[PDB]
Every structure is written in C-alpha cells, then in structure tokens.
Ligand binder design. Sequence first.
Ligand SMILES: [Mg+2]
Ligand SMILES: [Zn+2]
Ligand SMILES: [Zn+2]
Ligand SMILES: [Zn+2]
Ligand SMILES: [Zn+2]
Ligand SMILES: [Zn+2]
Lengths: 131, 505
Amino acid sequence: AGSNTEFASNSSVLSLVNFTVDPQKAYLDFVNAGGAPLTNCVKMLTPKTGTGIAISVKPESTADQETYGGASVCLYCRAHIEHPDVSGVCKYKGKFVQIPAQCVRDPVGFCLSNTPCNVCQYWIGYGCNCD
Amino acid sequence: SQIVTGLFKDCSRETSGLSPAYAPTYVSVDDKYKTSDELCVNLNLPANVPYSRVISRMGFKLDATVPGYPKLFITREEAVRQVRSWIGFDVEGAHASRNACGTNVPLQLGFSTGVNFVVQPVGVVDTEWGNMLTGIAARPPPGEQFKHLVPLMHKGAAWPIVRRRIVQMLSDTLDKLSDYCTFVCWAHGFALTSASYFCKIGKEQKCCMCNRRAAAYSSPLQSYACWTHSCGYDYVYNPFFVDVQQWGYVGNLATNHDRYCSVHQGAHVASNDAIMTRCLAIHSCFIERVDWDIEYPYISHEKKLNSCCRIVERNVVRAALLAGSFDKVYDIGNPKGIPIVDDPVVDWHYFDAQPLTRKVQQLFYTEDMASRFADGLCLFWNCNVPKYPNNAIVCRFDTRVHSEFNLPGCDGGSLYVNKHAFHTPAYDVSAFRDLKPLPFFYYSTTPCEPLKSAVCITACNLGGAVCRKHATEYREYMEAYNLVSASGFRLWCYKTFDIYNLWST
RNA sequence: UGAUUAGGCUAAUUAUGUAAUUAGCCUAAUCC
Ligand SMILES: [Mg+2]
Ligand SMILES: [Zn+2]
Ligand SMILES: [Zn+2]
Ligand SMILES: [Zn+2]
Ligand SMILES: [Zn+2]
Ligand SMILES: [Zn+2]
C-alpha cells in the first residue's frame, strides 16, 4: 500500500534530522564532515529569462541560477518534521526557489545558510544591492 | 541513487501525485509534469485544494557517523559494559485505516520495569502549508493474537503526557544505577519508529545543575539534565539501542526465551515482551558467555562489603572448624588456592571449575561426591550448587533481595555486579534441606588488655564480665555481620553446630 | 486490502544474449 517517496541513499541523514534537537546544525555538520548532500530534488526546466528573486510563485531563474521546487529544498519538508516558523507554515512550500549555479551541489544546505532580503527579495550576497 | 526505501512513504489514498511546487521529492511528483532529462514543467494545470497525506515513519536508520555525535546502536561489548542501563523495550502496533493505508503507529509501549503506556494514534500529515504530528484514524491488527488490543483503542492518553511519564519512570529506575539509558529491543524497526516520538539525540551534554551526564531534554526550557534533575522533562536524550535478534537467534521471541527461562510467563502485554527480551539478553551475555575481563566501577559500599565478607568468613570458618574437632577441609570455589583461616591447623584442599594454580584441582561438583567428601567439611563460600552436603559450611546470595549491585537475571537468578558480573541461580531453600541457618555469634581468642551479650563467645564472658578490647571488637563485628546480612548473603551450617561446644576452649 | 527481508513469475524503462531499477502477483521468515 502507498507510494514510495525517497531513495535509500537519503535515508541516513534524514533519520538523523528526525532525532536531533537542532536539525539545521545536524545537517550542516553531516555535510561538512564529507557526507553526501541530499539528492532527488525537483529541478525545473526554465527558459532562463527570469527576474532572479529568491522565492517566487513561478520560475524566475536568470542565466546564472536554477529553479527548484520549494518543498524539495526545505529540510523540514524533506525530513517531515515541524517547521521552526510562526504557526508552523513553511515559507518555501508552494513556491519556487532560485539557487545560484555555483551552489547547486547542495540546494537544501544553501537554503539553511542564506536568507532573502526583506526589501528587494534577493539573496544577500547573491543579488542584493542594498549596500 | 535508484534504490527507493519505504521510509516517508505516501500512505494517502490519492490516485495522483503532487505538483512540483508542493511535492517534496522528484519521485513523488506526478508523471504528467516530468520530462526525459529528469526535469519538471510548471504547467498551468490547476493547483489542488488543501490536502492531507499521511507519511510513514517506518524504516529509520541511525548509521550516521558525524564527528562529535555518539554512536547509539552500540555493539555487544559496549552493551555488556553498560548492563546497569539495560531497559527492555517493546511497542505494540496499530494499523492506519480510512483515509490512509500503509503505516503503523504505536498503541501500547511497555518497559521491563513492568509499566505499560497507552497512547492515542498519532502520525505525520503533510498539508499544503507544512507538516503536522496529529491524530489519525487507526485500526487494531486482525486475528486472535491481538484481541486484547481492541479495548485499548479508546483508552489512549496524549503523547506529551506519556513522554513526561516515560521520562519520570526512567528517572526513578536509573537514578542510582547509571547515567545512561540502554533500550534492549527484539526488533528495532518499530521500536525506533516509536522512539522517534519521545527520544532526542545530539552531541553529548552536561547536566545544567551538576556535573553528571545529561540524559533528559526539556523543550520548554531547551535545557539538558540528568536523572535526579529531570523533573518535568519530556524527552530522553541520547539513549542506546540494542537488537537482540541480530545476536544470532532463529524464530520469534517467545520460543527463544522459553528455552532457557520459565519464570516470565503471563498474558500477552508489551511489558511482558520487554521483560522477556531483557531476560534473553542477560542469558545471552552472562550465561552463554563469560567476559570476566570487564571490570565495572563502584556505585556504593562495595569495597566495604567486600572487606566485611572476609571478616565474617574468617570467624565463621574458624568457629566451624574448632567445633567438632575436624582435620580436613575441601574449599570448593577457590581459583587461587589461598587459605582463609590458619589458626587451627588442618589439611587444605582446593577445587574450582577454572583453577589458576596447579595446587588447585579442576573438579566440577554434581552432588555425586556426598559420601566421598564426607570425611571432612566442604566450604561453599559464594559457590552456587543445587544440593549441598550435610557436613558443609555455605554462604549463598539471596537473589530475591534487590539492590544497586544486584540486577534481575534469567530463570529466577540475578546478576550480581561487584568488580565483575556473576550470574547467580535462584535462591531455593530446598538446597539447604540437610543444613540449618547459622546463628549469630562472635568468637575471638586475642589476649585481653556496658556490653552484655549471650552470644559473645569470650573468656571474660565465662567469668560474667567483659573488657573494652573485646566490646568494641564485638561492635565492629556486629556492624560487619549486619552489612553482610543486609546485602543479601545467607549463612548455612551443619545440623550439629552448637555454640556451647566452643565454650570448652 | 499493516511492515520489512529473501526467493520465484510477469510487465515497463535503461544499459549492453544479459544485467540493473521500478511496478504488480505468489511463497517463506520476522514484526504488528
Ligand atoms: Mg511485542
Ligand atoms: Zn518547509
Ligand atoms: Zn536587498
Ligand atoms: Zn544533574
Ligand atoms: Zn525469562
Ligand atoms: Zn577480654
């Protein structure tokens, strides 16, 4: 009964994330120690003519970005645990996330390490010109 | 890469997958969005209304080796070294039904302390905004085996209450034994799935109020504490896990347990499976194998008890050997062959099952030498034999007494931990049918240089007096004898033992 | 029409007669 969702290679770190007190530190320590980053994310085929903002309702990737499904790049959605937000609502789910092309080796961990700007909605250091 | 797993299985009854913006994985995306180059297309196809999909927690694997994070699935040796932390653990299950199909949730959790907790059926539900850990529809397993689980489907308590109850029970059990918790399981899959509801892991931490290792976590306080400081804490921090079935067993738990033990019978409840699991682990580690190279630390007055045991033994053996005018002694159970008392000169012979000195024989005792060893006394100081001869002096531990250095064991026996782990068979008075309990008394012959006792065998007491040199000595011997007796040791002597035969000296 | 493991059969895809993965069905073991 039911349908499978995850590969076996991802079953190890996610299990750790299901048990740790601080899931973000657990995932980052797993990745920096040489562990394999999460795979099987939802990559989108885009014409590469987008605005470039971090989170959008449609794919808005530029020539130097890739578009991912939001729930596929959220660690709390991937591990199916509680979100550390107000009212438990994910800010990625239901939307598309633009990741820089030099970070596509770890779309999830990048989302754990960067936050968009509150004014221009770009990533800080990857499009935010609010200097 | 390509091998899928049953973990996080979508247990919903929906006939179609999710859209790319909502699906957590590429595999879970509906096939109408996919292309050949492993990519998705944002079609204008209408987005769904709010949904609820049950996610399975079956198939956890704690094999990660992140530095700084302790290894929680310990091996056999580390399990033996952590025997004071052993808690049996079994969870009964309930099948998800109605809106979902394909996962099981805990219904009853049982522990080897004899406690069962009934929980409401709670699972993980994915929605359009995030996740929930909420109640779901559930069904008891079919068959006559699980008919006792039918009334329990309406008697469950909330998971946050059960978490605190579990933490409190573990605190009460393990406060004076260890800083660690080791869950002994028979099938670790569903046990780990249930442990995900009430256990947290991470780096090793210190208790916030003292220097002990932290074993409990408080989410409302976000703090760590040990067993004595874990009031109101709702999570178990860094527990160990042991899978007995991986230790080379064939068949189910009941047939493997019943082969070596016949004490832990009863009705089918989760705490009974946990008790049988811990009993089987004890039998596997300390009866089938003897790892006497492992030395355990000191929790309490074990050095003092070890000192007092010799003080009792020397006086008891001297007084037994003087009364009756005996000349021969067989010291069964002496690996080194060191005599205990030597003021009455007698011939000594040493026997042990694993001797370490060529002055000691290699005899095993099976009662058949009752007439053979009848010319002299036999000594059974902490040697367990199912039938003792009449002319013997025996010291045996009463396994029905529970203490910090005496854990429950297999088939009525117990695990006595004093610098080493010894399994002791169950205490049975039928083995002493030819013997009588040894009365309390003190006999010494040191020269002399208020207290009045009828059992203080002393040359002054023959004259109706007493000296301080013997009075304080009698007081310390009383303290030592009382400590030895309270710890759980019982002394048995031959039938003709009378203290009035010692007054002739 | 509860879960996993091992074997067998079928279908699809991929690779180069054969193999891997996925999906379904049967058998056995354990868990429920
Ligand atoms: Mg059971
Ligand atoms: Zn999320
Ligand atoms: Zn900005
Ligand atoms: Zn403390
Ligand atoms: Zn037993
Ligand atoms: Zn005196």
